């Protein structure tokens, strides 16, 4: 095994980095872009789709977590299958599934079938990072590989900004009407289509063929890589004189056995310590990262809610008689009023409350209320014609001789720009971290860079209390996102270089499934901290990153070594 790797490294080391490596970089960055787009689709869609689809808070949470659950299943499944079948073929299959179900997710009305479609889309896109990083690792020489794999993660933010821009440019056109958010989903499903469009024109990695005892195919693939690179390099005349490289229902059962055996061999005597340390590192970093990134927007929303409550105005002791009103109101409180013989036609309300009032012989007509309530009010001989006033809108009230007529239809649930801008800021703030990590991975080292980024993030977590205003949260989120990305780039580079080529996609995929599993738990735990002491998330995220840092330092070193 060690003898084959030395020979293979020489073939790529002599030929050098040419057009082929760049072409593959782009056609794989397309798939990473597809993943980066898919991660935000449900997030940007909930506020708009909450009305049409009659969604409650529990449904909002389930829709939030379904993408991560699908990615969790898909990472393991495609990682296991890629080793036995290949990298190109499994990437094609996974991305085709993603694109097809994402396309069918826009023309869906029901909530359960929408959840099912998003789950299958997540399953499809789950196999992006494992197959992409592995399949590209086999065209790079040890002279410079840490740098090359780091630039490969620059496309995830491209996907993120693409999704944010389309959300900003498609969602706010509420007047299109099938509403706009479906068109936004359809637009966001295009990167996967481009991924299959480009990926079908690239070869399967030589290493898979060599490991499967198909040396002829590896030879022709290396011949193609040599030809493409020599077509426009300094020296085009040298011929590929390298001879052959060293040679080393039923199908369903065979694949099931082989995938299980490959997964089990990762816990063997030689890959026990490495697997345990990587499990710990992946779990702890994923937990903190997802917890903080979903905790910041919730805090911003909470602060905005507090400011809105502080902006409310009260109107006490109003008496009205024989008047008509047709003017909108928002964020007001009316206490202790007396209305007799009034009319209310074409009235719109938003976060308006009425306390201790009294309506006698009134008449409502075409009134829509959002977060509007009647507390301790009294109605006598009042008529409600074509109104949205539901049963729960009256609290501690008494109705005498009143009547509802021609009641409106719609979702009975009561909940019938900043997010986009904040998400764009974070996705752009992850840039300098990526640049420094890419330029200094092979110089500083994978282990040192991982440890430094992890401890820096853990220390920066302590300054959460320093920011209390709305502007401070944005800066803190940007600072955390921009400095913690190097930790993930180093981890992706480290996980590839540790396991052998026979297991790298299975081993990377298993750990990525753990990453998604930890993300779900972190999201669930951190969403409930709001309304509680600010020190709790600080303590949790600091302890998690500390445990990650110690374990990460305890791993071995891989810089400057053949990819065995």
């Amino acid at each position, epitope marked *: 095994r060690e003898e084959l790797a030395q020979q293979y490294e020489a073939i790529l080391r002599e030929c050098g980095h040419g057009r082929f490596q760049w072409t593959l970089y782009f056609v794989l960055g397309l798939a990473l872009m597809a993943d980066g787009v898919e991660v935000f689709v449900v997030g940007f869609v909930l506020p708009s789709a909450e009305k049409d689809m009659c969604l409650s808070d529990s449904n909002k949470g389930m829709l939030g977590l379904i993408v991560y659950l699908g990615m969790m299943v898909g990472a393991f499944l495609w990682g296991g299958l890629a080793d036995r079948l290949g990298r190109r073929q499994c990437l094609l299959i996974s991305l085709s599934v993603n694109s097809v179900f994402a396309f069918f997710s826009s023309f869906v009305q029901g909530y359960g079938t929408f959840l099912f479609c998003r789950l299958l889309s997540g399953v499809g896109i789950g196999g992006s990072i494992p197959i992409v990083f592995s399949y590209f690792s086999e065209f790079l020489a040890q002279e410079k590989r840490g740098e090359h794999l780091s630039w490969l993660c620059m496309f995830w933010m491209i996907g993120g900004v693409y999704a944010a821009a389309m959300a900003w440019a498609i969602i706010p056109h509420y007047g299109w009407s099938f509403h706009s958010w479906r068109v936004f989903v359809l637009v966001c499903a295009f990167p996967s289509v481009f991924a299959i469009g480009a990926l079908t024109t690239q070869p399967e990695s030589p290493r898979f063929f060599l490991e499967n005892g198909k040396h002829d195919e590896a030879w022709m693939v290396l011949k193609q890589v040599h030809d493409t690179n020599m077509r426009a390099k300094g020296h085009p005349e040298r011929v590929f004189s390298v001879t052959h490289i060293k040679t080393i229902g039923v199908r369903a059962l065979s694949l099931g056995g082989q995938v299980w055996g490959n997964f089990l061999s990762c816990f063997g005597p030689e890959y026990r310590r490495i697997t345990l340390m990587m499990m710990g590192v992946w779990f702890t970093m994923s937990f903190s990262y997802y917890g903080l990134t979903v905790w910041f927007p919730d805090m911003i929303r909470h602060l905005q809610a507090v400011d809105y409550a502080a902006r409310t105005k009260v109107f006490p002791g109003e008496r009205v008689e024989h008047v008509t009103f047709n003017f909108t109101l928002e964020n007001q409180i009316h206490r202790g009023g007396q209305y007799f013989n009034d009319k209310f036609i074409g009235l719109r309300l938003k976060s308006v409350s009425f306390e201790d009032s009294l309506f006698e012989e009134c008449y409502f007509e075409d009134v829509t209320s959002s977060n509007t309530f009647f507390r301790n009010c009294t109605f006598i001989n009042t008529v409600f014609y074509n109104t949205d006033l*539901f*049963e*729960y809108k*009256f*609290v*501690n*009230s*008494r*109705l*005498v*001789n*009143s*009547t*509802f007529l021609h*009641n409106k239809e719609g979702c*009975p649930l009561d909940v019938t720009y900043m997010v986009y801008f904040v998400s764009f800021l974070g996705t752009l703030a992850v840039l300098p971290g990526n640049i420094v990590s890419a330029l200094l991975m092979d110089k500083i080292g994978r282990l040192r860079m991982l440890a430094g980024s992890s401890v820096m993030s853990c220390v920066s977590c302590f300054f959460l209390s320093f920011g209390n205003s709305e502007s401070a949260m944005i800066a803190l989120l940007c600072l955390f996102g921009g400095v913690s990305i190097a930790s993930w780039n180093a981890l992706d580079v480290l996980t590839v270089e540790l396991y052998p080529s026979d297991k790298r996609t299975t081993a990377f995929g298993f750990l990525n499934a753990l990453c998604k599993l930890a993300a779900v738990l972190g999201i669930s735990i951190f969403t409930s901290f709001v309304g509680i002491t600010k020190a709790a998330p600080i303590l949790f995220a600091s302890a998690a990153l500390a445990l990650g840092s110690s374990l990460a330092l305890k791993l071995p070193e891989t810089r400057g070594q053949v990819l065995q």
Partner: nanobody
Amino acid sequence: QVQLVESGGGLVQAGGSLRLSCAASGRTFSRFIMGWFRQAPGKEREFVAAVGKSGDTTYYADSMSGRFAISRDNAKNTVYLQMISLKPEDTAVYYCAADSSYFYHTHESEYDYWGQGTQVT
């Protein structure tokens, strides 16, 4: 299917007071707008009073505010209709109904389930 039964009726001297208890069954009881209907001899069912899904708001019919009081107890899963100053005109079979809609309604067609009914003299 929610099963409703009413009890607490019985002959009452003029000007007295009486109570009727409408007990439901099943966990799903906070998702219905409870009501009370009565059917006098020779007349059709007429809506009397109703209470909200949380017991906070009441909904009385014309002239039924002052003699009839309606309340619900979620802990015991039951509804109470207190009547005072009973006159001979208040002779009927008082039914207990359930409505799953999100609006207060007086028509009997809108209400989903019904009760066995009890006689009040």
